[PDB]
Design brief:
Shape: globular
Strand order of the largest sheet: 1-8-7-3-5
Organism: Hepatitis C virus genotype 2a (isolate HC-J6)
Number of strands: 14
Largest sheet: 5 strands, mixed
Radius of gyration: 24 Å
Membrane topology: Single-pass type IV membrane protein
Structural class: alpha+beta
Protein name: RNA-directed RNA polymerase
Number of domains: 2
Helix content: 40-55%
Cofactor: Mg(2+)
Strand content: 5-15%
Bound molecules: the ligand Cc1ccc(C(=O)N(c2cc(-c3ccccc3)sc2C(=O)O)C(C)C)cc1
Subcellular location: Host cytoplasm; Host endoplasmic reticulum membrane
Length: 548
């Protein structure tokens, strides 16, 4: 019942890794300069391994049995199809890790003979063999964060476990359609990845308002992936099998479950046997759907066992938020402890113990929270925000190491109406773009399930369509939000908001001097930086539509 077994071999890197950066341009200020940012590397891999390696004690009950029955009934309402080899190859991202069999993403997408023939043999093998464990590679993820003294030492690198490219294409042929339909079918509104920022805000406000006396809480499972058992994974397969699927897919799904999802041998970058996994692999197609559904099942059963009154849940993988009817502060705490005890028995122990919350602004769901500000007519306007420490630390890093994929562009788009995106990120990046003279150059940013490409000059139209014109007129932010943003800049050692405000005026003027689309960006995105506001009318943005 151990999540992992290790041989002793180390988790090794592929290319040299840099954890501490040279110079920082964001936390830049004539007499004030700092660099309190870092990147996780292979060096902390052993520490992470220790943390995620433990025995899982799982014991189910009637509450769990009941919920699982309901979910399988809901799943039987779903029909899914196999993807063709061509479709599977086309869904393969352009730079996904190459195969050890002489081909890479490029060849998969161009349907080269070598790649196609290999994938076909892998598929045939899945239909013929439902037992032989499929090997996986384990690597330490390189992610950037800001040092946070008060909250303890630096984070250890997360561990990524994934199978060969050939197997990944096959997972899509067999389960991609299911991943796109199943979660919403069994969870409905509770499925978190179906909402745009404005939609998520609407869901939370509605949920909170429908309670006579609301009480909410976020549950943080300690290393969720490591807590899911072989039995949990086989149960996920039974849920998949409850759907209406072609026999060929059923065969492939069973094989993938027994040979890959339920666990298997892991090798490091050097090819050395590193260990055996008996929990969720982070790099397989079903990770998101599996975590989401399994978290939901355990959480719903735990709500019933704990006596949670009228729970409204929002699930994003291992991220869970429960809003219900308060039974009084003392009883709420008692019910939460009961919920936690139930979750623990289901093998979903808490990292940070949950606590009842009676202020919606303080409830974090899917890494975000709802806040409020005033619109142009003075009425309350709700929007989605989040602690800006990590996104700014990564924006500051991606400025000295402008990687192929940006995270700042994504944050600017998803959190466009926030004060930290408007005062800090937009000011900074439009300044960098003009300095580099690459304003019209298209860039690749990362939304969660799909990498996209966009031109910075298209931001105002994109933002209007995504958040409405209010995104350019929001004012009178809450003191909690102002305080949190100021704390982030302090932790990053970057100039404070009052200084960014001075800078935004200069950036705005520069954009307007360039005329054209750049001028539109200046007038719309920085109308907040001048006392005499501009009218700002609807833009021809009613010519776009996004997926994520
Ligand atoms: C993105 C954006 C930035 C500023 C404003 C704004 O109009 N103000 C504000 C200035 C602030 C400020 C200035 C310096 C340091 C910290 C905060 S906070 C604030 C507000 O309306 O909430 C006025 C009180 C002058 C509206 C939107």
């Amino acid at each position: 019942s151990m999540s992992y077994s290790w041989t002793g071999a180390l988790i090794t890197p592929c290319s040299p890794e840099e954890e501490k950066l040279p110079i920082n341009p964001l936390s830049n200020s004539l007499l004030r300069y700092h660099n309190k940012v870092y990147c996780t590397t292979s060096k902390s891999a052993s520490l992470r391994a220790k943390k995620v390696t433990f025995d899982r004690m799982q014991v189910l009950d009637a509450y769990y049995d009941s919920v699982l029955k309901d979910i399988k009934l809901a799943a039987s309402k779903v029909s899914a199809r196999l993807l063709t080899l061509e479709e599977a190859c086309q869904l393969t991202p352009p730079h996904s890790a190459r195969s050890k069999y002489g081909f890479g993403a490029k060849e998969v997408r161009s349907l080269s003979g070598r790649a196609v023939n290999h994938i076909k043999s892998v598929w045939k093998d899945l239909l013929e063999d439902s037992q032989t464990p499929i090997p996986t590679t384990i690597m330490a993820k390189n992610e950037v964060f800001c040092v946070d003294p008060t909250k303890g030492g630096k984070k250890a690198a997360r561990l990524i476990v994934y199978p060969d490219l050939g197997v990944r294409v096959c997972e899509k042929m067999a389960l991609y359609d299911v991943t796109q339909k199943l979660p919403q079918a069994v969870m409905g509104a509770s499925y978190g990845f179906q909402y745009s920022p404005a939609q998520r805000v609407e869901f939370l406000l509605k949920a909170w308002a429908e309670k006579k006396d609301p009480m909410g809480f976020s549950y943080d499972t300690r290393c969720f992936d490591s807590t899911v058992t072989e039995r949990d994974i086989r149960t996920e397969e039974s849920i998949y099998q409850a759907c209406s699927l072609p026999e060929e897919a059923r065969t492939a799904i069973h094989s993938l479950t027994e040979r890959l999802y339920v666990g298997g041998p892991m090798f490091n970058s050097k090819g050395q046997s590193c260990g055996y996994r008996r929990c969720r692999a982070s790099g397989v197609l079903t990770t998101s759907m599996g975590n989401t559904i399994t978290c939901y099942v355990k959480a719903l059963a735990a709500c019933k066992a704990a006596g949670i009154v009228a729970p409204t849940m929002l699930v994003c993988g291992d991220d869970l938020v429960v809003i219900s009817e308060s039974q009084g502060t003392e009883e709420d705490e008692r019910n939460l402890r009961a919920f936690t005890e139930a979750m623990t028995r289901y093998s979903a122990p808490p990292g940070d113990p949950p606590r009842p919350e009676y202020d919606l602004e303080l409830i974090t769901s899917c890494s975000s929270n709802v806040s409020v500000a005033l619109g142009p007519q003075g009425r309350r306007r709700y929007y989605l925000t989040r602690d800006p420490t990590t996104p700014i630390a990564r924006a500051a890093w991606e400025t000295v190491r402008h990687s192929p994929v940006n995270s700042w562009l994504g944050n600017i788009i998803q959190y466009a109406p926030t004060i930290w995106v408007r005062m800090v990120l937009m000011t900074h990046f439009f300044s960098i773009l003009m300095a580099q003279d690459t304003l019209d150059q298209n860039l690749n940013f990362e939304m969660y399930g799909s990498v996209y490409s966009v031109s910075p000059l298209d931001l105002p139209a994109i933002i209007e369509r995504l958040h409405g014109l209010d995104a350019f007129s929001l004012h009178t932010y809450t003191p909690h939000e102002l305080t949190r943003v100021a704390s982030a800049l302090r932790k990053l050692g970057a100039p404070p908001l009052r200084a960014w405000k001075s800078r935004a005026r200069a950036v705005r003027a520069s954009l307007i001097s360039r005329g054209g689309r750049a001028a539109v960006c200046g007038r719309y995105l920085f109308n907040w930086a001048v006392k005499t506001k501009l009218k700002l009318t609807p833009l021809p943005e009613a010519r776009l539509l996004d997926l994520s």
